[model samples]
Target chain A: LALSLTADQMVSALLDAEPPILYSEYDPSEASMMGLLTNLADRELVHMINWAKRVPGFVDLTLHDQVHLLESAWLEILMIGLVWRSMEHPGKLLFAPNLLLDRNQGKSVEGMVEIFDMLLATSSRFRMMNLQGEEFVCLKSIILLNSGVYTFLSSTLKSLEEKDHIHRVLDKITDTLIHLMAKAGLTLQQQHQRLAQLLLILSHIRHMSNKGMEHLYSMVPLYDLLLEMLDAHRL
Target chain B: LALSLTADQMVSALLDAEPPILYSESMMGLLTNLADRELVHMINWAKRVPGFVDLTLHDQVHLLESAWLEILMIGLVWRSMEHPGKLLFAPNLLLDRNQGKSVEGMVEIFDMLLATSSRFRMMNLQGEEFVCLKSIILLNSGVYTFSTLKSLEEKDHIHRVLDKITDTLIHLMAKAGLTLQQQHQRLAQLLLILSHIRHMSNKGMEHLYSM
Candidate 1:
């Protein structure tokens, strides 16, 4: 009830502040390209952090919880964004605007091919669903808000269930997501089916997040922010 | 104890890896230059400490960044223990207790180092105890993640980890076969050495800034 804006207006504001998609300026070979792509991802992460701060009700959470949410969820957010970015190009992962890699190219980098496969599978499923851009933003926002939910709620809010802003923030984000789904003109039956499918994608996304870190930890301590994000996500 | 061999082994390995002191035409320049070389050794040595790498990368780096100067001071005091009236800044760089010609504040810092070295001699500090004490110093260095509610449990876990290492130090003391009371007294004195090092470290930083 505290949210005064309509769902459509909320989505519009999100689109307006959306971070621009950036391209890889370098031409490193696939063998040496992971570093450059990681650098690109790091830049995108900064944009993601900025985008999240402007999110409605986000600022109201304690700064510690804000940091907690972002730290816990940044990988999931990046993974979903990666899927959305590459969904248009079947069989290849578009890590940046100019950077695209197929299975053949994935073999050049150690430990990356496994991640690429999982991403490609998710991308194919996303394309099959014909996902909408509006749903993407709301769903990404939900994912960002929901990361580390169990750990946070059980540990911090066990006694004070009523005053929990996290629960409120998540409910609003989920409500916004459902509205975005309905406005796509789906029948009630289709909406339920599609929402289920989208929600299930989160499990695979979480799986990919775990697997991705397992493979990437060896190459870590990359940059300070990246290192902090990776370390924070580990637990 | 299983850790006894590790503590003993680390002392020899550290001694072997100790940086050679490079003398310079200018005294302050020599000390500052030696610092850069020693920092590299100190960082690498920290990575080799048992269970250090097992810590979160953030915690590992935080401990070193906070306790590095104190760790180096402990090493200097240990190295200078047998020299009497002189301080061994490095294997080759030595300064007299009264040597103040290099810098206006050298005498003050050198006196603190000499006094620490004398205390170490009075206690008959052993190599094993020195290594364990340094590890305790580092473990005492806290972490940033420790500030959050989510990490409050992590803070407890780290405290237990610190206790485990500190227990190892106490066991090393027990091996000296001193009476229980004597052992407690010696342990207290050894821990007290940290305060003097802290005092020296504060003065040392000020001297560096003045230079």
Candidate 2:
């Protein structure tokens, strides 16, 4: 009767229960527009938010940090989840069917010029790595808990009590996920590399994400994603 | 009287009754002694693992280099858990924060080290959990350096030891009255903090080790 959701079930509840809305077609007028464009991605953010809350120790966060974390993290989570979808087409970021963009459009719409290259690279690397769903979900949890971005926020966790408790749930899920990976038939070294590959890829995304913010002209400005996600605040 | 320790009693038993590490005038000499003592204790700790020593020396040393500082720091924090801001280096030796501030370049890492320890204490990090985590840390098998072959055999030996240690940790956590969810969450919290520890290790290696 107590908290019963396994980390696996948490991922299934979030991703498998519903097919995320992918924009299948493009509207030049709307493509250049901000509000309508973030529609599917924004709706998906709601699902992502709920999924993170169910991650066990996440709810133990002081109410302030809980909001701040989701606020700051939504877009990266969005982009991370969409790694596969973004590359469904060779030269385009598959935002929606008709909404796919060539490198030029990415630059104009979101200042994603070189990031377009990075995304292509990110996905190709992922394709070659043959990452599993469990590993993907595990990496996603790691990002959610990096909670480093929130350091700038007034409500960011500072004390040991807050810091320790927040990452507890996240860390627990990591071991289970890695155990699952080992069970899936990797040598100890291979399993280690599998995770190392994961951490390296996350770092690459983080590095590129920081730079892309300057060029961002997306549906949600970097700040908007922080403020609009849910219970987000400024100051 | 066999294996009968209250949780609190076990923590007291596992933690060194000696003073915490401190900066001294005899820097080079102290570091050598300090390093040797830590190495010896850790090797003794490794005795609990089934085939840890069977691994090649190159592999053992590789794991030791990355692992030593983190485990050393974990103990200092465990000793100081009850006294928030101080580093409890020895029974009679407690270094206050401001004293830490005066030490050359020690403040930043000292502060970071203190925070890591505090986080460990806050998580109610248990003795068994700490011992098990040190094993996982030394396995150094997971985070970095995926290099070497007979390295494969070496890591395989470690992987078996780590799984066994992890199982014992889980059993101990259960007997301590934690729910399965709490146990899982705490272990992850404990392991995950290593990221920050890794950051601190790099800083220490760059500044302190160079000294």
Candidate 3:
């Protein structure tokens, strides 16, 4: 009940903000409230999102609502899910949604795929600078989907192309995210490599379309590109 | 004297073979002979390919004249030149230009870029049956450069687009060279991950592009 009340308060606050400020600079009051709200949101959402695993009636939520809830409350819930999942299952921490789509019910697959698609599309908005503010949030979402959630969907979805399509969408989101971070002067090399490797694995397994292949090919680094970049910076 | 004669005979054999036959599978014997001759030619053409740090002159010639002197020859010679004071030096163990780019001068930079690029490429190529083959050669080439050679070109070369292009070429060659022995396949994963990490470091520093 306490968790639910806190969640209700967060929802109310979110609705009241009108256009909802997802992030803010480090002014004193902004920092304090942001920290408090983030912590509270994390705690409340962990309970709600983990309901399927911990509470008995969790799966009874309508499939559409399940996806909708995740999409709507993404900013509030994703990081908490990532932290919880990473701590609980470090081996399966990274975003590799292929592991999940191999397992869940058909409708569940469609629902989750739709959720991921919407989240990615929504994320594609918010120009590069604002998008930078949501880097961790985006990463967290990828991790959550890659974990058990993705596996459940995979089990349910029969079409290989559909599964591949989901991965492709996820890859596009990651690429966009990395590009946004790049614009913000954030070095996303490690994560970029991680995403690239994941995409590469996917490409090898499926008959990736020409566009997908082209994207993958473009990622290949040329000799001295980074070295030259660093040299120029130092000078 | 015997080694020189053998080198001459090998080159003669290569010159005699048809160009297409040089790459043919059925002519394994001829191919081996041709490979050896090519290495010898490369060794003779580029004096710097073989560093003569410590080995007796006779031994250097003997090593160079041996039947299988492809990557090994290049490794030893390149190492000596790059590190003059280093103990492991042999004059006969250098790479031959073989009519391509100056592999000797570029080996240090190329090798580093290759390692990083190949790993990422392999990760991308995963699930393909021949990926292991491509990955193996990439690993071997990197190890040879890092452990055997001295003085890598500046890390900046790693930042450039050319490095990626080089990696693509290496991957293409590796795929073509896969064999039943699977020597290349054995070392694919380790090389792939190491290269991926290197590639990441390079990418992180991309913000410094204009600087």
The CAPRI-style docking tier of model 2 reads incorrect
Candidate 2 yields a Cα-based lDDT of: 0.57
Q: Which ten-residue region of model 2 chain A has the weakest summed lDDT?
A: A147-156
Tens digit of per-residue lDDT, candidate 3, span B1-211? 1112232232332234212112212222433455545555444432322122133454344433321232332232223333322312123222222311332233332343333333234334332222222222222222211101221221112112122322332344356574412212222233323322332223322312323
Chain B alone: TM-score in each candidate?
Answer: 0.83, 0.76, 0.22
Interface RMSD, in order shown: 25.3, 7.0, 16.0
Instruction: Provide the interface RMSD of candidate 2 in angstroms, 1 decimal place.
Output: 7.0
Candidate 2 lDDT over A150-230, as tens digits, reads: 242342436446655545555555555657666788764454434544554564455445444434433255345534554
User: Between candidates 1 and 2, which one is better according to TM-score?
Assistant: 2
What lDDT would each prediction earn against the true structure? 0.65, 0.57, 0.30
Q: Estimated TM-score per prediction?
A: 0.47, 0.54, 0.23
Chain A TM-score, structure 3 = 0.29
Q: DockQ numbers for every candidate?
A: 0.01, 0.07, 0.02
Estimate the TM-score for candidate 1. Answer: 0.47
Model 2, residue A221: distance off in Å is: 18
lDDT score, candidate 1: 0.65
Evaluated at residue A178, the lDDT of candidate 2 is 59
